[PDB]
């Protein structure tokens, strides 16, 4: 419950938000898109100038959204590698007098990658249920990879909206056709991850629902056959689930009333090997999470954003330095602090150098954190010098 | 000698549970309802989420002590998690998320258990008490409660208890469980709010207490039964999960009941004086001052001085200055509806307040202000140049000396 | 241009009203650690130490306070806590090992501002007091009692007093003048006021003696800054013939304070300006702007070193809020002041160029360099 080392992150800029967002507000792009509840959407980027850079946060407008409409979720992706362009999906709710009127807008336009052109290409589609999360996945149909939308609904069902070149439009299709594991749901699904495998026809699918039911499925794609299945009933809503390779595969479950945990060796031990992240429950409710290498050591670490304005970062030890009883578990690497509840993160190279900035969307706005440049300037030089020396010794 | 071990064991204080209560008194003890006997009991608890177990257990212990002054409630949860007969006492007290516990409450009367021969607790007892007092024909009769717990499943089992007592216990347990479920529903609504999904969940669409007349504060503030809530935590960035989240929400909400009063008062006593009315309360003066910044001040010394007559002269000087100020546009503000003077002059950009008082051998003038704002400040420092707190003292002293010339004392 | 958002802070309880010049920070117990001093209208001076919200101690004065100061005005080499009321009363306090004063000495009333410095360069320190009636009076403590010195009279209002190393290497006293002007007092005792004008009666604040190098504080000055209430900031150097304007910035807020503070730790001092609505600005000597918005309304502002945690002085910001709370931000240090990523910070180093020359590379493409950086950063094997 004690940090080991200081935070190597230095905050660069901070753009204030007039109105708050929600956990589904953060989108991708090397630009960035973030939308507020009241329909104001902003594009974040950086512009170079002589020997420095400057953040730019430019508001954007989409054609067919009512001024009274309230935006619920947003996402986007790039077209399939055979194709070209980007597609942006936004789900809002009209206020039909005293009822909700859900909807879904899909924007996709040379100008296939031009965001300004894509700003007005939408299609208006009813939803008949209150949407929860707009995500997307890539599937192997025939011998071609195709990217399709996914959207959890008020009725415990996931509704796929596939593109069609014949009509050049997105139409709803049954989810059982492509995703056998995404059927027969009891509670609404807050978060859902589809982890493809590299180069094979297999993959994993992880999902958690409001009641705390978490289902993980090892699913093929060529035969569309579920191989195995595991499920666990926890307490409290499942805020986040991420499928990641620790070094073999493992998963991370971030609840809202219990310490976040990681289940190891899914394909070899099911869901019986559990490691809890110590002390990650003393800071209110874990609203977000992200798994990547923040230590620049070539091995991933776990980021946990709490409602109590905390940004804990946990590091895995590793059997390579296995220490008997205190075995290769998890320990608190370091801990930062903020002033607003934390909602979403992103790990994107906005500057344009190869170093990855961390964008954090909180209640009042967006913080662009960078690595400590002084630390990230001597370390690269030492690595390069060692590389040259070993090359000479090996020459 | 041997005093603690005969109570640490044989009384359920330490050690482990007997194999009798491990599995025997749950079979053919429950079947007493199948055959039909005088120990029927049941429960239908279906708790949503397991984090309510400790509060529910504490309340149930309280109830047991309430309608039983002889029971000896003692939780015997198996604190090993291996499999067999792991029941180790948990002194007046979770580990893993997915782990589902297994608890076994018990209730007993040690005094009656000491030597059952007479009426244990007549009229609040077995309803089969007593028994022949003759030796060998002694009285086998006692009472017990053996509530069992699964992940989310309670089963109430009583034996040899007053039927009204048992029925009341069952009804109370069901009601308490429903109370806790309603509290959990409120907490879930709050959590769904926190992520920024407002019209996705809510304490409007969904049990005696689930009616659309729920008293939120009573549920939050109580662990036992006796602005639009759907958008409470929206754009608000203010500083047992149920207690935690509920009290946080309570303070967040009270931070508006204790705030909008100030705005209401300031708007009221700005529009009233904009176009003095009434004796504004003394307490309101503190708000009016602490909500305003001390812009300018001026001071002078009363030279007609080295006394009661001096006090009277100072009062006359003060009243002359008050008259002069009133000849400019500033009105007087009455005070003390249970020597210091206060004036004012409302302006379109805001209000201006002046305080006049005498300190030792000096006279004090302070100007407050309370608000684009450039125009207000342009006229805000248009009273400073017209204070003239020096020429006035000059003329006052000269008039006083002339009057004393035209007179005597 | 870039904004920031500081986080760490400590709140202190302080109920009352005070003038904008009734707050200061400095060492009073001679422990080499600064403490916070606030003098209220009610006639009490509270000193906060370390991080407790409750005041460390309190001293009682007579009359209502308008100026506070800490320093070795007595020229005894020990720091004293002096207070100046509105009724022309001077009070002195010493607490280095309640708290009644030790020296009361009446003076002219209408006291507005205050300064302590060795203006004459005589080795003694001469207390200087401005008055709301455009009158400046110099004093000196001689054994003990206070004695008067040359007095100056001006037309425009007096807002601040500053001591700056003049072109001849001698300390110079200047005072702000409405209309974005400033006057210099010659103090020839060992015209007497010379004014320079750079709307009509806009209030102007001014600060001087801003450092330019590491350790060059014993004898270093030459820079001074003006701020106008209608949102106009200027930094300029005096030097011999005619003062040279370094930079000028136009903003759209009501500026009501002006301070100097070193945050990057490189030796230079940065201009720290505030506003009524709380939009703080920080600018270095090269027109690099760092904003900081506090979602409140500000009564009083302060800056400088403070000792909050671990018994180590650190740069701080002090705000007084309408909600009877004093906020102290004590983690304001910045790694730099501009925005540079890695492809231009590392470009400066020449060893990097030589070492990239050894590895058969010569940066021209940029994607190649990015790939090399990514491999060296996230792929150490």
Alpha carbon distance A277, A281 (integer Å): 9
Task: Give yes or no for B1 touching A (CB within 8 A).
Answer: no
Contacts of B298 in chain C (CB under 8 A): 110, 132
Contact criterion met (CB < 8 Å) for B373 and C254: yes
Please identify which residue in the block is written with the tokens 């503070």.
Answer: C261
Tell me the C-alpha to C-alpha distance, in Å, between residue B102 and each of B22, B80, B154: 12, 10, 10
| CA angle C69–C70–C72, rounded 5-degree value | 125
Gap between the terminal Cα atoms of chain C: 40
Indicate the DSSP class of residue A161: E
Asked whether the beta carbons of A190 and A239 are under 8 A apart, the reply is yes
Nearest to A291 by CA among A321, A322, A249: A249
CA distance C217 to chain A (A): 27
Q: Which residues in chain B are contacts of C110 at CB distance < 8 A?
A: 298-299
Which two structure tokens, joined as six digits, stand for B282? 């003394």
What does the DSSP assignment read for A65-82? --TT-EEEEEEEEEPPTT
Q: Are A251 and A206 in contact (CB under 8 A)?
A: yes
Kindly determine whether residue A72 and residue B192, on different chains, have CB atoms separated by under 8 Å: no
Distance between CA B146 and CA B45 in Å, rounded? 15
E strand residue ranges, B346-400:
351-359, 362-370
- The beta-carbon neighbor of B195 closest among A22, A154, A235 is A22
Q: Kindly list the residues from chain C whose CB atom is less than 8 angstroms away from the CB atom of residue A13.
A: 2-4, 339
Q: CB-based contact (8 Å) between C351 and chain A?
A: yes
Asked if A114 contacts A89 with a C-beta cutoff of 8 angstroms, the reply is no
Give how far the C-alpha of residue A177 lies from the chain's centroid of Cα atoms, to the nearest Å: 25
d(Cα A293, Cα A222) in Å, to the nearest integer? 32
Task: Give CA B339 to chain center in angstroms.
Answer: 42
Q: CA C71 to CA C92: how far, in whole Å?
A: 11
CA dihedral of A120, A124, A129, A135, whole degrees rounded to 10: -40
Question: Residues with Cβ < 8 Å from B387, sequence gap 6 or more?
Answer: B298, B365
Closest CA to B332 of C280, B324, B349, C121: B324
Classify each residue of B249-266 as buried b or exposed e, where b means 16 or more C-beta atoms within 10 Å of its C-beta: beeebeeeeeeeeeeebb
Bridge-partner residues for A337, per DSSP?
A310
Neighbours of chain B (3+ CB pairs under 8 A): A, C
Task: Report how many Cβ contacts below 8 Å link chain A to chain B.
Answer: 74
Residue of B292, B299, B387 to mutate, testing the C interface (most C Cβ within 10 Å of its Cβ) = B299
- What was the resolution (in A) of this experimentally determined structure? 3.2
Sheet strands side by side (includes C44-48): C23-26, C35-39, C44-48, C57-60
Closest alpha carbon to B240 in B222, B266, B253 = B222
Number of other residues whose CB lies within 10 A of the CB of residue B407: 7
- Kindly list the residues from chain B whose CB atom is less than 8 angstroms away from the CB atom of residue A188: 200
SS3 at position B399: helix
Check B297 against C86: CB less than 8 A apart.
Answer: yes
Sheet-wide strand order for A310-316: A286-292, A301-306, A310-316, A330-334
> What whole-number distance in Å separates Cα of residue B318 and Cα of residue B308?
15
Q: Please state the three-class secondary structure of chain C as a single string.
A: CCECCCCCCEEEECCCCCCCCCEEEECCCCCCCCEEEEECCCCEEEEECCCCCCCCEEEECCCCEEEEEEECCCCCCCCEEEEEECCCEEEEECCCCCCCCCEEEECCCCECCCEEECCCCCCCCEEEEEECCCEEEEEEEECCEEEEEEEEECCCCCCCEEEEECCCCCEEEEEEECCCEEEEECCCCCCCEEEEECCCCCCEEEEECCCCCCCCCCCCCCEEEEEECCCEEEEEECCCCCCEEEEEEECCCCCCCCEEECCCCCCCCEEEECCCCCEEEEECCCCCEEEEECCCCEEEEEEEEEECCCCCEEEEEEEEECCCEEEEECCCCCCCCCCCCCCCHHHHCHHHHHHHHHCCCCCCCCHHHHHHHHHHHHCCC
How far does A37 lie from chain C, in Å, by closest CA?
21
Cα diameter, chain C: 80
Tracing tokens 């210091």 back to the chain, one arrives at B340
Please give the Cα distance from C316 to C245 (Å, whole number): 28
Spatial contact of B203 and B230, defined as CB atoms under 8 Å apart: yes
C-alpha A72/C-alpha A35 separation (Å) is: 9
Sequence-distant (≥ 6) Cβ neighbours of residue A325 within 8 angstroms: none
Contacts of B200 in chain A (CB under 8 A): 72, 130, 132, 154, 188
Residue with the two structure tokens 């202190």: C12
Q: How many CA atoms lie within 13 A of A47 on its CB side?
A: 8
Query: Of B200, B234, B241, which has the smallest distance from its Cβ to A257's Cβ?
Result: B241
Decide: C344 and C273 in contact? Cβ < 8 Å.
no
Contact criterion met (CB < 8 Å) for B199 and A93? yes
Residues contacting residue B95 through CB under 8 Å, at least 6 positions apart: B81
For residues B89 and B104, what is the distance between their CA atoms, to the nearest angstrom?
Answer: 10
User: Mutating which of A34, A256, A362 best tests the B interface, going by the most B Cβ atoms within 10 A?
Assistant: A256
Task: Give the neighbours of chain A: at least 3 Cβ pairs within 8 Å.
Answer: B, C
Rg (C-alpha) for chain C, rounded Å, is 24
CA–CA distance, A291 with A260 (Å, rounded to integer): 13
Q: For C325, name the nearest residue in chain B, comparing CA atoms only.
A: B290
In chain B, residues with a C-beta closer than 8 Å to the C-beta of A22 are 195-197
Q: Which two tokens stand for residue C45?
A: 């001076």
> Any long-range contacts for B81-90 (C-beta under 8 Å, 24+ apart)?
B85/B16, B85/B17, B85/B19, B85/B22, B86/B16, B87/B16, B87/B17, B87/B21, B87/B22, B88/B15, B88/B16, B88/B17, B89/B12, B89/B13, B89/B14, B89/B15
Residues of A with CB below 8 A from B205's CB? none
| DSSP assignment of A166-230 | TTTEEEEE-STTT-GGG---SS-EEEEEEEE-SSSSEEEEEEEETTSEEEEEEEESSS--EEEEE
Q: Phi and psi dihedrals of B233, rounded to 5?
A: -90, 70
| Contact status of B301 with chain C (Cβ, < 8 Å) | yes
Cβ distance B360 to C19 less than 8 Å, yes or no, reads no
- Coil/strand/helix, residue B246: helix
Helix (H, G, I), strand (E, B) or coil at B351: strand
- Please tell me if residue B403 touches chain C, with a CB cutoff of 8 Å: no
Nearest alpha carbon to residue B339 among B314, B372, B310, B375: B314
Give CA B121 to chain center in angstroms: 40
Rounded-to-5 percentages of helix, strand, coil across chain A: 10, 45, 45
CB pairs under 8 A between B and C: 37
Q: Which of C7, C293, C376 sits opposite A383 (nearest CB)?
A: C376
Say how far apart CA B244 and CA B261 lie, in whole Å. 27
User: Quick check: B101 and B149 in contact, CB under 8 A?
Assistant: yes
CB atoms within 10 A of CB C114: 19
In this structure, chain A runs to a length of: 395
Strands A250-254 and A240-244, by their bridges, are antiparallel
Q: Tell me the chain A residues in contact with residue B51 when contact means C-beta distances shorter than 8 Å.
A: 235-236, 257
Chain B CB contacts of C64 under 8 Å are 359, 364
The H or E element spanning position A345 is strand A342-348
**Chain A contacts in chain B segment 202-241 (CB below 8 A):** 234-235, 237, 241
Q: Among residues C174, C159, C188, which one has the least CA distance to residue C221?
A: C174
Strands A41-49 and A52-60: antiparallel
Taking CA atoms, A16 is separated from A31, B239, B262, B287, C294, in Å, by 18, 19, 27, 31, 12
Parallel, antiparallel, or unpaired for β A301-306 and A310-316? antiparallel
CA distance to A302, A383, B89, B340, per residue, from C380 (Å): 19, 8, 53, 78
C-alpha dist (Å) from residue A88 to A94, A117, A170, C95:
19, 12, 12, 68
Please give the backbone phi and psi of residue A252, each rounded to the nearest 5 degrees, phi first: -125, 125
CA distance C316 to A12: 19
Write the DSSP symbol of residue B51: G
Provide the shortest C-alpha distance from residue A191 to chain C (in Å): 28
Q: Does B50 touch chain A (CB under 8 A)?
A: yes
Which residues in chain B touch residue C63, judged by CB atoms under 8 angstroms apart?
Answer: 359-360
Cα–Cα distance measured from residue B283 to residue B335, given in angstroms and rounded to the nearest whole number: 10
Return the residue matching tokens 């509290």.
Answer: B183
Are the beta carbons of C190 and C145 closer than 8 angstroms? no
Between CA B312 and CA B310 the distance in angstroms is 5
Residues of C in contact with B291 (CB under 8 A): 322
Give strand pairing partners of A90: A74, A105
Q: Which B-chain residues 9-38 have CB contacts (< 8 A) with chain C?
A: none
Residue (of B197, C378, B166, C229) closest to A354 by Cα position: C378
Q: Is residue C265 a contact partner of residue C211, using CB atoms and an 8 Å limit?
A: no
């Amino acid at each position: 419950a004690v940090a080991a080392g200081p935070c190597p992150l230095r905050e660069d800029s901070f753009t204030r938000f007039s109105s708050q967002s929600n956990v589904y507000g953060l989108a991708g792009g090397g630009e960035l898109l973030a939308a507020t509840l009241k329909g104001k959407v902003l594009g974040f980027r950086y512009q170079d100038l002589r020997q420095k850079i400057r953040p730019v946060a430019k508001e954007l407008q989409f054609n067919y959204i009512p001024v009274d409409a309230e935006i619920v979720s947003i996402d986007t992706f790039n077209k399939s590698p055979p194709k070209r362009g980007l597609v942006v999906g936004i789900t809002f709710i009209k206020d039909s007098g005293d009822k909700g009127s859900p909807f879904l807008n899909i924007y996709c336009d040379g100008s296939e990658y031009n965001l300004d052109s894509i700003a007005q290409s939408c299609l208006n589609l009813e939803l008949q249920f209150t949407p929860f999360q707009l995500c997307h996945a890539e599937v192997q149909v025939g011998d071609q990879l195709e990217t399709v939308f996914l959207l959890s609904g008020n009725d415990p069902a996931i509704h796929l909206y596939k593109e069609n070149e014949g009509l050049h439009q997105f139409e709803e299709q049954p989810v059982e056709n492509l995703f056998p594991e995404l059927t027969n749901l009891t509670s609404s699904v807050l978060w859902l991850d589809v982890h493809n495998f590299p180069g094979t026809s297999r993959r994993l699918s992880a999902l958690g629902c409001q009641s705390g039911y978490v289902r993980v499925a090892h699913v093929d794609q060529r035969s569309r056959e579920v191989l195995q299945m595991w499920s666990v009933l926890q307490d409290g809503p499942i805020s986040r689930v991420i499928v990641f390779s620790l070094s073999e595969y493992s998963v991370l479950v971030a609840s809202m009333l219990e310490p976040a945990v990681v289940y190891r060796d899914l394909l070899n031990r099911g869901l019986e090997d559990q490691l809890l992240l110590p002390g990650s429950d003393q800071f209110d409710s874990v609203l977000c999470s992200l798994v990547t290498d923040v230590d620049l050591d070539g091995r991933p670490e776990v980021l946990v954003a709490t409602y109590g304005q905390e940004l804990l970062c946990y590091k895995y030890r590793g059997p390579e330095s296995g220490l008997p009883e205190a075995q290769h578990g998890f320990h608190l690497l370091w801990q930062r602090s903020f002033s607003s509840p934390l909602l979403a993160m992103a790990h994107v190279d906005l500057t344009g150098d190869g170093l990855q900035e961390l964008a954090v969307v909180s209640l009042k706005g967006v913080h662009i954190l960078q690595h400590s440049l002084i630390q990230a300037s001597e370390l690269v030089l030492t690595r390069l010098r060692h590389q040259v020396e070993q090359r000479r010794r090996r020459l | 000698r041997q005093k603690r071990r005969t109570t640490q064991l044989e009384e359920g204080e330490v050690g482990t549970l007997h194999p009798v209560f491990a599995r025997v008194a749950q079979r053919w003890m429950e079947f007493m309802v199948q055959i039909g006997c005088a120990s029927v009991s049941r429960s239908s608890a279906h708790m949503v989420s397991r984090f309510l177990l400790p509060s529910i257990l504490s309340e149930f212990t309280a109830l047991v002590t309430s309608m039983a002054g002889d029971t000896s409630v003692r939780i015997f949860e198996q604190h090993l998690g291996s499999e067999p007969e792991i029941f180790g006492p948990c002194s007046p007290g979770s580990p893993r998320p997915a782990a589902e516990r297994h608890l076994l409450l018990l209730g007993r009367n040690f005094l009656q258990w000491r030597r059952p021969t007479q009426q244990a607790a007549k009229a609040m007892q077995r309803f089969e008490p007593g028994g022949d007092g003759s030796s060998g024909r002694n009285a086998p009769r006692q009472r017990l409660l053996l509530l069992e717990v699964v992940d989310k499943k309670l089963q109430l089992l009583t034996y040899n208890w007053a039927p009204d007592l048992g029925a009341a216990l069952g009804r109370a347990l069901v009601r308490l469980v429903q109370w806790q479920n309603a509290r959990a529903h409120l907490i879930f609504c709050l959590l769904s709010q926190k992520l920024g999904l407002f019209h996705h969940y809510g304490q409007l669409d969904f049990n005696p207490f689930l009616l659309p007349t729920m008293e939120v504060e009573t549920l939050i503030r109580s662990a036992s039964p006796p602005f639009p809530f759907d958008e409470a935590l929206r754009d608000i960035t203010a500083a047992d999960p149920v207690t935690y989240h509920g009290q946080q929400f309570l303070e967040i909400k009270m931070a508006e009941r204790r705030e909008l009063e100030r705005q209401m008062k300031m708007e009221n006593l700005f529009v009233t004086w904009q176009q003095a009315t009434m004796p504004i309360s003394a307490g309101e003066l503190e708000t009016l001052k602490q909500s305003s910044r001390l812009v300018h001040y001026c001071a002078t010394a009363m030279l007609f001085d080295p006394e009661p007559w001096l006090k009277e002269l100072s009062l006359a000087f003060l009243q002359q200055y008050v008259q002069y100020l009133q000849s400019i546009g500033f009105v007087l503000v009455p005070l003390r509806p249970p020597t210091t003077y206060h004036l004012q002059r409302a302006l379109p950009g805001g209000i201006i307040l002046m305080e006049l008082a005498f300190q030792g051998c000096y006279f004090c003038v302070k100007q407050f202000a309370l608000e684009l704002s450039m125009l207000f400040t342009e006229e805000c420092d248009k009273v400073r140049d017209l204070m003239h707190v020096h020429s006035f003292s000059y003329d006052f002293h000269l008039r006083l000396v002339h009057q004393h010339v035209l007179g005597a004392h | 241009m870039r904004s920031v958002s500081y986080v760490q802070r400590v709140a202190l309880e302080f109920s009352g009203s005070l003038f904008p010049h009734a707050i200061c920070l400095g060492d009073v117990d001679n422990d080499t650690l600064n403490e916070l001093v606030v003098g209220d209208t009610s006639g009490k001076v509270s000193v906060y130490k370390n991080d407790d919200s409750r005041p460390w101690l309190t001293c009682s004065c007579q009359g209502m306070l308008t100026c506070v100061g800490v320093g070795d005005v007595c020229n005894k080499g020990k720091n004293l806590l002096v207070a100046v009321s509105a009724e022309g009363w001077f009070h002195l306090f010493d607490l280095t090992p309640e708290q009644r004063p030790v020296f009361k000495q009446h003076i002219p009333a209408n006291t507005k501002v205050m300064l302590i410095s060795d203006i004459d360069g005589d080795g003694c320190r001469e207390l200087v007091v401005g008055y709301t009636d455009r009158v400046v009076r110099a004093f000196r403590w001689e054994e003990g009692q206070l004695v008067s010195l040359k007095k100056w009279m001006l037309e425009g209002q007096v807002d601040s007093l500053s001591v700056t190393l003049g072109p001849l290497g001698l300390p110079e006293l200047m005072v702000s003048q409405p209309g974005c002007a400033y006057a210099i007092l010659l103090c020839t005792w060992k015209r007497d006021v010379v004014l320079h004008q750079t709307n009509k009666n806009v209030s102007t604040h001014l600060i001087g003696n801003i450092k330019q190098g590491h350790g060059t504080e014993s004898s270093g000055s030459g820079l001074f800054a003006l701020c106008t209430l209608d949102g106009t900031l200027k930094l300029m150097e005096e030097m011999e013939e005619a003062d040279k304007l370094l930079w000028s910035v136009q903003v759209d807020h009501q500026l009501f304070a002006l301070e100097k503070l070193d945050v990057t730790g490189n030796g230079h001092e940065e201009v720290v300006a505030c506003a009524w609505d709380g939009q703080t600005y920080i600018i270095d000597h090269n027109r690099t702007v760092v904003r900081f918005q506090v979602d409140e309304n500000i009564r009083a502002f302060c800056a400088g070193l403070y000792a909050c945690k671990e018994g180590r002085n650190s740069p701080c910001l002090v705000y007084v809020t309408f909600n009877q709370k004093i906020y102290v931000y004590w983690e304001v240090q910045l790694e730099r002041m501009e925005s540079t990523n890695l492809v231009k910070l590392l470009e400066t180093k020449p060893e990097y160029h030589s070492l990239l020359q050894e590895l058969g590379v010569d940066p021209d493409d940029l994607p190649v360099t990015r790939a090399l950086l990514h491999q060296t950063l996230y792929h150490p094997d």
